[model samples]
Structures are given as C-alpha cells and as structure tokens.
Target chain A: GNGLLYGKRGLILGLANNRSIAWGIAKTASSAGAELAFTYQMKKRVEPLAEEVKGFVCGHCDVSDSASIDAVFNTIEKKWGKLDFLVHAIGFSDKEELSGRYVDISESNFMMTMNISVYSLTALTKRAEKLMSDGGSILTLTYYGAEKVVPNYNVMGVAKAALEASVKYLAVDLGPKHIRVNAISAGPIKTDFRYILKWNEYNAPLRRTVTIEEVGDSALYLLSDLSRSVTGEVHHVDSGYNIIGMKA
Target chain B: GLLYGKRGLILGLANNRSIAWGIAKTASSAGAELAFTYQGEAMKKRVEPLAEEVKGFVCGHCDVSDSASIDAVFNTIEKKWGKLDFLVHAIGFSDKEELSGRYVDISESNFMMTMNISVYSLTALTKRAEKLMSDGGSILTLTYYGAEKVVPNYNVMGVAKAALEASVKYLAVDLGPKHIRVNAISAGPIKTDFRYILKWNEYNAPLRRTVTIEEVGDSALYLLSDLSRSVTGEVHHVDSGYNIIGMKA
Candidate 1:
C-alpha cells in the first residue's frame, strides 16, 4: 500500500454490496491507508464490506431524513472530530419514474428525487463544512443522462443534471475556503448490465464499460490531495463514454 | 417561420455583456417567444429585467444544477405553451482567476466545474429541450476562435469550447432524424463590457474590424429563422473573416 491517503480520514456513503461502486471506492481508499467510516441503510450488507476495509461503520443514514444524517456526522465528530474527504455516491428515484417520458413525471416524485439525489450533497456538505474546518474534498456520482436525452433515464437524468450543476455551484461556493467538490459521471454498470454493456462496448471511445475497481482508483485521485487543485469537476470513468455521443 | 409564434428557451443569459443577450434581443424582435433561465438569486435579478425588455418573462426560477428547478421551468412552459419551437444555448463558466493563468495550472475541480457549466450544461438543456420540439427546432450555441486554434488568455475556455463544439455535432446527428438542428456561431470579439481584441481584428481580419453584438444578434436571428433550415451540425464563423486570414496585414 502506498498510503496515498495515509493519515487522511474519509467518509463514504452508498455502499450496498461487494460489486457496489461505493465498495470499490472504500476498498481503494482503505488500501491507501485512510481511516474511513461508512453510512448504510442496510445494516447487514454494510458489515462485511466494513470488516474487509477495517473501517468503522458510522451508522444508518437516509439523506432525506436530516436526523439520520446528523447522527452519522455526529459520530464522525465525536470519534474523529475532523474530516479530510467525502465520497457521495448517492442517488435515489422511484424505479417507476426511471423509464417512460420525463415530461410525464409527477411532481411528488420530482421533489423526492431532487431531495435525495441532488440536495443531499449540500445537506451533507453543510455538516462537513464544520468538520472540515481545515478544508477538504467532496465527490458525487452522476451520469451522461444529465447532459443528453437517454431514453428511460427519465427523472434521474434530470436529477443528475441538477447534480452536475450543484457541483459547480458548490465548487464556487466552497473553493475560497480551500474545500473542493466534484463528481464522476460513471458509465453503465451491471444493474442494467446486459444491453447497457453491449451498447457501451460498441459506442464508447474505449469500446468498453468499466469495473468497480477502476472507478475506485479514480475515486482515490479525487479523494486524495493528488488532485488538490481539482475541485468542482465531473471526471468520466467509463472508458470515455462521454466523448462517444450516440454511435450510428 | 421567421420565429413568429415560435417558443424558445434561452440558457446562459449573464447580463448584457454575454453573447446570449445579443441573440435574445434579435430573436425577441423577430417575434419569438423567449423563456430565459437564470443561475441564482443575483442572476434572477439580472435576467428578469432583460427578459422584460424583450417583452419576455422569467418563465421559471431555475438553476441548471437543481433538477427540481429545471423541472419547474419546463413544467411551467408545458402548462402555458404545450410546445417549444427552438432553443438558444450559450452557457460556459470558469473562475476569473483561472482565465488569467496557464491552462496547465487549472485546478482539477475548476476544470470539471467549468466543463459542467460551460460544456455539459449544453447537454443538460438539450436533453430536456428535445422533448418539447415536436415539429423539429433549431438549437444555437456560441463558440469562439479559441476552440479551434489558440489565444493568449483564452486558456481553459478553449478546451471547454472544443468539447462544446463536439457536443453540437453529436447532438446534431442524433437529433437529425427529428429534424432538430444543432449549430454554433464561432463569433468575433464583440463590444460588450467594453472588451477587446479590436485592434487585432482591425489589423488582420479580412473585414478589418471587430464585430458588434448587434451583428452576431442579427446573424443569430438569421440562423434561428427558416433562412438556415437546411444547415445543421456546423460552426458558422461570424469572425469578420479573421478566421480566413493566414497572415496579418
């Protein structure tokens, strides 16, 4: 281990399972010698991953629920008192709303999706601001849907658009304080793995999707000071899917 | 259609100094229904009056980053108009600090933030705009000479505009089937904010003078109307023929 994150303290949200992008980031950050904490909705699925990284399980967090968010940050403060970096690979929307036309979206779902996926960064970062008095880095996950029309990407695409916009707003907001904010507009994963995989292979600039491990490594760059000067960026980690556009 | 009864969405309106403002003025007079978007509270103040001067209004309080805010804009549009005819996208950002320095020193965060705002914002708006253009529409974006060649202080903005120009092509091809046109104007330095490069164009450009916002605005009006219906996926230069000059006077 190079200890690239040696002596650094980090917090990761959104780890669900072994293949989850959050785990990949957690694994990479841990291997680099950062002491880490995690917030999970499912208590059981998080433990094994936590055990493997030797990271502390911060506790449950429902981004929409301010109290739950406070508990996790409170635990981080009581134990560590300060944070160096944060990985915010979090988003949520009704699966029903993920497909069909975004134009037909219901107002209730629209607000809910923004609250959890878009506003959570600001909500969480407001807390991290106090903990990161010495300045820090923040990262979130987004997608190509935000930039262009991806059929069935629906509301999440809009959410990611707002999320991408939020990163810039936050970057400008936090930059003077030396705190940084950015995002990874990751490519399709196994969640919709079959067709998503084939289409990406044929169209992406690199002609392939990516593994969770590759994402983790990139996460390390943003999370670590190696990219110290970089803030408010959305780095693409999907074998260059962004540049490919819609392939004929 | 001469843009009469045509409804359009204009993003990237940052006061009168911006290229977007120039486009909006002509489109408004050409009888287009213009809906403008703003970034924050300060911008809301800056853009609302501009929206009114053209007899348009701030249709929605929007920040491109908040999906809800964007939704608020489109939903209001959907409620009032039921359809959109075109869009003018002129969005880009960088720290004034980054603009003065070497592109190599652009902080990673600013690089992403700049791309997100300057470059990706185009994709973000277009994806949403695609749904509204049922009868096909024209999309106009602003670009610059720096995107292709280089300029001393153009800096990271050059890279962002290169990506912006590429996006215009991809968007053009994808939306071609629907007859939705995507294009850009790599305009010359206009006299906004009392800005410069006047002497450079005067000395070297074939036209021998810097262009004005009114010229770009009139050109945008031409592109927005039926006159350019056959053109798409192009970066039309309105650079006073400076782009054609291989050598100075």
Candidate 2:
C-alpha cells in the first residue's frame, strides 16, 4: 500500500480462495502499486479475484506439466516483456500421506509431491531469470516443518527442505546477476482439536500463531528492494515461535 | 585450559595447515585432553607431530570407510579416556573430477561415495559417540556455504553437505532427550590455502576479509563448550556473514 512497487510488475502463482496465503500476498502487492499477473488451473475460481485487482490472467498452469508452465511464461513474455518480481505460492501433498508419519511416505507420492511442490519453483525461476535481466527479487512460501520435524507435515517437510535448499542454490546462481532469491517460512494458521494451535500460543516466544495478512506484509518487504542485501534467506514471520527450539 | 578436565576427539586434522589443527590447538590450550585421528598409518607420521604440537594423544588410524577401524578408535577411547566430553568431525571427500563440472553429470558412484563418507560418516560417528557421552556432550561437524548454496567447484560436494546438515538436525532430535547436542560450523574459506575462493568471500563477506583458522577455532571453542549449552540442531555460520549478502552493493 506504500507504492513500494509503483513501477513494478510481477507474477503470483497459486492463489486459491480469499483465505489463501497467495490471496493475501496478491492483495498486499496490489495495494503497493504492483501490476499483477496470475496463473491458475481452474479459470473460473480465479476470474473474480483477478477482476477485483485488475490482474491479467496469464493462462492455465498445472505446475506438474512442463507445457502448461511454458504457455504461462509465453503469455508473460507477450504481455510484460520484462518482470520485476515473482511470488511462488504453490505446494501439494496427498492428504492421506500428510496424515501419516514422514517415514511412511511412498516413493510414488514422494516423487509426485517433490515435482509439484519443490521443482516447480525452479521451473518458474529459470524463466523468471530470463525476464529479470535488470535485477529483481523472488520469494516463495515455506513452513517450520522444513527446519524441524512437525507431525503430519511428513514428506512435505522434506520437500520444503529441498525447496529451501534450492532457494540458497538459486540465490548463489543468480547473485552476480543481481537477482535475489528468498523464502518466507511463515507460521501455520489454523485449528486442530485446538490443542496443537494452543501449544504454540503457550510455547512460542510471541505466544500466538500468525495471520495471512501478516505474511503478506512480510512478503511485501522481501519482494521490494527494502531487503536489498538479504538473499538466500528463509525469513520467518511466525511470531516468535521459530526462535524457541522446543518449548519454555 | 578451560577444558582442563574435558576429553575431546578430533577426526580430520590433515596436517599443520588444517582447521582441525586450529581447533585442537585451541581446545588443548583450554585444558582439554585431546585425541586426534588420521586416515590410518599412512597419515600417523604426519598426524603424530601435530598431536604433539598440541600436547595431545594420538587416537590412531580411523577410516570412516571401515566400520572396524572407526570402532577400534572408539574402543581405544573407552579403555583410555573412559568418557568423551566433545567430538569434532571435520572430514569430507569427493573425487576431484566430480567436484566441479556440473552436478548432474556427477557419477552415481562418486555421489554415493561422497554421501557415505562426507554425509553418513557423521551419523556413523554419532552412534559411537553417544555411548561414551553418558554425562552429556557435544558433537560438531564441518559444513560449508556450498551446502546451503551452490559454490561452483563445490558441485556434488554441495549436495553431500546439504544432506549432512539434515543429519545434524535429525541427530539433534534423537540425542536431545539424552542431553547430547549436535551442531555444524559452515566455515568460510580459510584464506591462504583456498586462494581461489579467497577473493570472492573477501569482497562479498560483510567483514570484507576471509576468516582465519584461529577465528573459526575460537567460535568452535564456544560451541564445544558449555557456553552454547542451549543450542543444538543448528548450522552456525562462522563465515564473516558472507551468507547474508544478496548482491554486493
């Protein structure tokens, strides 16, 4: 909302319903004067949100398909010519597997999950790098599970670990080119029997979970030059939880 | 020696030029009884002098490649020192041919070998270490920024390091309940020996210079001592904060 992105145009992938983390980022970036482009596999569900922000619908994209990803970037090339930033907010793991132990992940699901959740970031970045010739910032979403073992988060945790590692590798590969890469390992925002959510409230230094709006605000900072010197970072916006290892 | 009553084992001092020597020298100065391991007899002659330089004991040859060789050294510790207060695993390997020239083309044989020695060897050592750490202890491993990011010539070695980092994490969890801690130092290039990397870090690192083994040694001293009692499962960088810069201004 501060016009930090006044002359900038960016792409945001994976905005679901308004409650989505991407939705929050899109709204926040729009408020900051960013020209927006969006991609979704389901066109109808996204049209309304895009219209609200005057966003350009790049095309249908199923990160699992290479051609679909290519088409999306082709659209980006035709429309923008150059890109200033990118927000990758996509990840998927079978619910059945998520509810199981990390050790229980099947190889089939493991490969599938990694393809969609982890490799997609690289796939997007390779193309984004081409458009970022003048220098830019790239951000992705991750969670604490990537750093520590979080029950039920399972293979997604491992995938996030790979994603975080890629953030570092990509940052290095692109550093000299002046294109920075970073990730936001935001705190979980939800309910279980309520005890799980309650546990962190009592344990984390901040004693509370986080909000999507808060994550959006944090993402705004990473996407802007305000964080000019910070690259290869996994910025935590999860209250004060990440700092306290186990519990008080 | 701050470690006047402590027993410490160091597993990778190649010679006087090593960071391991820096750690061994500092730890010995702090009163800790030191034990150094080399790659077997071929290295014993070279290692013994360094051990003597620090007024320490030579624990004999340890081939991370051979479990029996690893066990023999631990057996020696059990009979002589009785208990271990800390351990420093500062070893890594990758064929020179595989170190550069893109990671994808790296031979699966080299990849497997690198992971087994550079990565899993820490796991192997941790298992042996826990049994001797009955009174609580610390284990330190060495990693580099290449593991966190790509440092070119660091190719497959980089991937190996990334896995090594996770090994630190998982091991930290497994040993947390027992009062044992696990950690890694992502050291920056030691100036003179790594001249090729010296300039990049000197220019990009926040301090505008590369780190010395003595500097890394002092930081390792803190991690190995009770000074960092509450820290575990963390990859602490002693790299002049070079990891923090996005693009140099």
Candidate 3:
C-alpha cells in the first residue's frame, strides 16, 4: 500500500452516522494504515453513532459551541497526546437563507453561517496547531458555490468563499511552521449526509455527482505523504464540470 | 485529437516569425489543416504568400470587430471547408500611449475599442462558432498575467484581458453540454508586433527573458488538440513558471 499516511495519527470531527464524511475519511485513513480518533456532537447523541466507529476511539464534542471544543480538545490531549492530521467536516447555515437569494441574507443568518461554516475551522486550526507533531496537515471542504452563485446555495456560498480566503492567509501565516493547510472544492455529490442536512444540488461533470469515495480518497492524499509538497491549494475533484460556464 | 480532421482558423500573422504563423505550422504538422484570416491589403500581402506554404489553407480577410466582415469570412469557410474544428483568437490592440502611460489615463474611446476587440469579440465569435460547430469543437483565446497582477503600464489592455478571461469561463459553461470547449492560453510576454509600441526595458520579468513565439504556438496546439480533452473552462499558463514567483518576499 502507498505510505501517504504511514504511521501518522489523525483526529476526525463530525461523524453522525456510518455515512458521514468523517467516517469515510476514517475508513480511508485506516486502510492507508494510519491510526485515527473520532468526535461526535454530544454523549447522548453519540450512544448509537458511536457503535459505527467501534474499533476506533469515537467521542462526543460539539463544534458550534466553544466549551464543547475545549472539552473535546482536552479529551484528545489526554488520550492521543499529539496529532498529525485533522478533518474539519463541521459546517451549518440556517435553512431559511440557504434557499433564498443572497441579497435576502440577514445579520443573524450571516453570523450563524460564518460561525459554523467559517470560524469553526479557524478555531479548529488554532487548537490543532498546538497538537501537531513535527509538520501536519489541516483540510476543510469547500464548494464552487462559494465563488459562483449556484441556485439555492446562497448563504453557504458566501461562507465557503470566506473559508477559501482563509486557506490562502493560513498558508502564508503557517508556511514557516511547516503545517500544511488546504481545502477540496469537491463536485456535487449526493452523500445522503449532505441531503438530510436540508438542500443539495448535483451539477457535477462525469454526468453523475461525485461519490463519497472520491472525496475521501482525495482527502486521504492531501493528509498523507502524497501531498507533501502541496499546500494552500484548493484542489477540485469535480470532474472538470466546474470548467463549464453554464450547462449547455 | 480535438482537432482531428478539423480546421484551425488562425489570425494575426506578421511574418514567418509571427506567433500566428508558428501556430499555423504546428497545426499543419499535427494533422490539423489551417486557414489564415488577415486584416486588409497590407496584411494580406504578407499572409497570402505565407499561407501558400501550408496546404489545405485558404487566406481570407476578417476585421473581427465588424460583424458583417466576420460573417463574410465565415461564409467563405462554409463555402469551402464545411466546418472549422477550432479558432485561435490571438487578436488584441491598445493605443501605444495606453500601453505605456498610467492606466487611469486610458481614454474612454480606446477603452471601449480595446474591449470590443479584445474581450467582446470572443462573446460574439462564440455565438457564431456555436452555429458552425454543430457537433462539437474548441474555441481558444489569448490572455496575459497582467490581468491578474497589475503590471506596470500594461494599462487598459490588462483590464481588457481580465474581461476576456471572464468571458472564457462564461462561454465554457454556456457551451459545455454542446461538446464545445473554450479556453485561453496565458502565454508569457513575447516579442511581437503588439509590443513594438511599448518599451520592455522597465518591465523586468522573473524569467529574465521574453517568450519565444514557438513556445506560445506549442501551447496553442496543445489546447486545440485532443491532449486537452479533459481540460476546459481553464487557462493553461505557459509563462515559464513566472506566475508562482513573489519577488522572494
């Protein structure tokens, strides 16, 4: 097997079920031969979801709340002690604005979108930086809707745009620390996890939307040795569909 | 090859050394037949003789900004070739003063004309080419890095390029399902008739040299060929790695 993550350690946050993006990454990393840990939203919520990640250490930790982030980091510090990779798959925007035009965006809605969708990752970076051993990788998910006005992707688009800008700034700030940061602008994929959250679209190339395995596999490369020289880049695995200006 | 059994419409050739001519030669060699679209009697005097050197090519006049002239040019192609595989839009213009002086000082008329020819023409050409390409084909345009980073006095032309690249993306998405591909080659600075107006002394490039016409021509062929099958709605940078440098800051 490829040694992209050989002997490396990682922490994944946001696995609600077996189909969560975090669970997919955990499975890929496990196959890549890396040790991993999982974090859920809360203890009661984790009871059933925890069973899916039975072999791996899955704990409860809500990302939207600060105290939860602190308590979870404390638990992570106690058990794993240090980390090499982190996948921030946590983001949320109020459903009201998610379907409306961007002009209708409200202050509370904007703040909520920026908080869970953007700032949460910034907070994740700060905490992960402390636990990173040697050099490490930090990756987040983003979409083209952030740049383009994709239908029904209003508030989330603006948040993802902010997230992408954060990638560039973080790269320049952390390049000296040898801590690599990047984001994947994955093509639309119906990862049921995405649909249940409310709304999702699939206008990706390759005709069909991207598969969960595509995103997970690409993430594995970024976190593993394959992307040693790649950082501060938004790699798109969206089947060249993004290249099209408008659907013909 | 995307251009397999297709015709390449090339414009803007000056002499044997012109990038347009270089592209014509490469396309011919690569099994893509070529055609030359020159401006008037002056350019025709040079283009007609040079085009004769390549077989299966017809020399015609196309003042791109004029719709009737473009129609006339395409009609001629229709009468002869039946279809065009791709178009190489290596056309651009800016007032020499606009190319050198402060960008803010660019005249309103020159700005509009520069946009009309440099940027807007692609929008128009995409419309026309869409008809000619019933099945599918590729549309290629030219741009420069000056559009992204404010180069010293590239001035209004730089803004025109920014608009041009945007059009490329818009056109790519607009025509993707039709099997048509649209892209641009952001070739590094090259010594061409377009640069005779501006002095290159103050413009110290990272590569410490100008791009060769052949290099640009090679990039054009790659995009026009099947090798770039999976690539569309993207710009290929052929600037000798000049784009990634940040003055070591």
Write down the TM-score of model 1's second chain: 0.93
Candidate 3 per-residue C-alpha lDDT over A1-248 given as tens digits, one digit per residue, 9 for 90 to 100: 66667778888777666665666676677677777777776555444544443425445666666677777777788877888888888888887666654434454565566667766776677677778758889889888775565656755765676566556555555667788889988776564346522232343345566666778899999998778888878888777666777643
TM-score for each of the candidates = 0.61, 0.61, 0.51
Error of 3 at B155 (Å): 1.2
What are the runs in model 1 whose C-alpha is more than 4 Å off? A148-151, A191-193, A203-207, A245-248, B1-220, B230-249
Q: Identify the leading candidate in terms of DockQ.
A: 2
List residue ranges in candidate 2 displaced over 4 A.
A191-193, A246-248, B1-145, B155-160, B171-249
Task: State the lDDT of candidate 2 residue by residue for A1-248, as single tens digits.
Answer: 48888988999999877888898898888889998999987688888998888788888899877688889888998988999999999999898877754434454565567667866877788778888999999999998888787766766775677678768877877888899999999887762426657787788788788878889999999999899899989999888788886668
| B6-47 per-residue lDDT for model 2 (tens digits) | 999999998877789889888989888899888857689899
- At residue B9, what lDDT does model 2 achieve? 94
Clashes per candidate (backbone, < 3 Å): 11, 5, 8
**Which has the greatest lDDT?**
2
- Indicate which candidate wins on TM-score: 1
CA shift of B189, model 3, Å: 1.0
* Tens digits of lDDT, candidate 3, B1-249: 435577867767767876777777778777787878878788778877777787745557788778788888788888887877888888888888756664434454665567667766676666666777745677888888776655656756665675566557656766778778889988776665346312241144456566777888788888888788767868778776667667631
Per DockQ, what order, best first?
2, 1, 3
| Chain B TM-score (each prediction, in order) | 0.93, 0.96, 0.90
DockQ of each: 0.03, 0.10, 0.02
Candidate 1 chain B weakest ten by summed lDDT: B190-199
Error of 1 at B97 (Å): 23
